[PDB]
Enzyme design. Structure first.
Site, short mmCIF file in Angstrom:
data_model
loop_
_atom_site.label_atom_id
_atom_site.label_comp_id
_atom_site.label_asym_id
_atom_site.label_seq_id
_atom_site.Cartn_x
_atom_site.Cartn_y
_atom_site.Cartn_z
N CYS A 58 0.84 -1.18 0.00
CA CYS A 58 0.00 0.00 0.00
C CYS A 58 0.88 1.23 0.00
O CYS A 58 1.71 1.42 0.90
CB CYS A 58 -0.94 0.00 1.22
SG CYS A 58 -1.95 1.45 1.31
N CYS A 61 0.24 3.34 3.51
CA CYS A 61 0.63 2.89 4.85
C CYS A 61 1.72 1.82 4.86
O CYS A 61 2.24 1.52 5.93
CB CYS A 61 -0.60 2.38 5.61
SG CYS A 61 -1.24 0.77 5.03
N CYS A 107 -7.41 -0.94 0.95
CA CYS A 107 -6.54 -1.35 2.05
C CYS A 107 -7.34 -1.39 3.36
O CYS A 107 -8.00 -0.42 3.73
CB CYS A 107 -5.36 -0.38 2.18
SG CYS A 107 -4.24 -0.79 3.58
N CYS A 110 -5.54 1.28 6.24
CA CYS A 110 -5.64 2.72 6.13
C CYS A 110 -6.80 3.17 5.24
O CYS A 110 -7.09 4.37 5.22
CB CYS A 110 -4.33 3.33 5.59
SG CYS A 110 -4.10 3.18 3.80
N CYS A 130 -7.18 -6.16 -9.96
CA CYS A 130 -6.83 -5.14 -10.93
C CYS A 130 -6.54 -3.88 -10.12
O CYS A 130 -7.44 -3.31 -9.53
CB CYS A 130 -7.98 -4.94 -11.94
SG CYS A 130 -7.44 -3.84 -13.28
ZN LIG Z 1 -2.92 1.19 3.43
#
Ligand SMILES: [Zn+2]
Length: 142
Positions: A58, A61, A107, A110, A130
């Site tokens: 991510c 985060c 995610c 976060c 995707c």
């Molecule tokens: Zn995140």
């Protein structure tokens, strides 16, 4: 009868950054994608045609999301992976925009918008994650 909201909507994210910090630390595209559920244009992303071994995290985060070993060329215009490092890292929600049904992926730590998951992926999973290039950071393998 459907799933909606990231941890930001629920105001229970494990990790929370101020929008001011994110405006500086992300490019305008990375900010738009992750924070405003934007979508990069087809083939806009560095990671679309990118095959180096490593881990995609991510971009907001740092939670690890995807292994290079599951990346494949979907011809779609965005990074494509047939599995996730582990599904607890993802929040799946139902996306009904444009008179169609899709499953959005965010995610779980976060709340960053990542992309969508589809059922047209290759074996062994049959899944296509995707994912916007601009939702990811890449860490090369040792
Ligand atoms: Zn995140």
């Amino acid at each position: 009868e459907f799933q909606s909201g990231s941890c930001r909507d629920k105001k229970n994210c494990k990790v929370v950054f101020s929008q001011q910090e994110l405006r500086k630390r992300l490019t305008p595209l990375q900010y738009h994608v992750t924070q405003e559920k934007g979508t990069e244009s087809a083939f806009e992303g560095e990671y679309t045609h990118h095959k180096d071994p490593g881990i995609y995290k991510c971009v907001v985060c740092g939670t690890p999301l995807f292994k290079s070993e599951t990346k494949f060329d979907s011809g779609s215009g965005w990074p494509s992976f047939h599995d996730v490092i582990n599904s607890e890292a993802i929040t799946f929600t139902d996306d009904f925009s444009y008179g169609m049904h899709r499953v959005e992926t965010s995610c779980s730590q976060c709340g960053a918008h990542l992309g969508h998951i589809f059922d047209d992926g290759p074996r062994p999973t049959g899944k296509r994650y995707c994912i916007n290039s601009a939702a990811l950071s890449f860490t090369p393998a040792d």
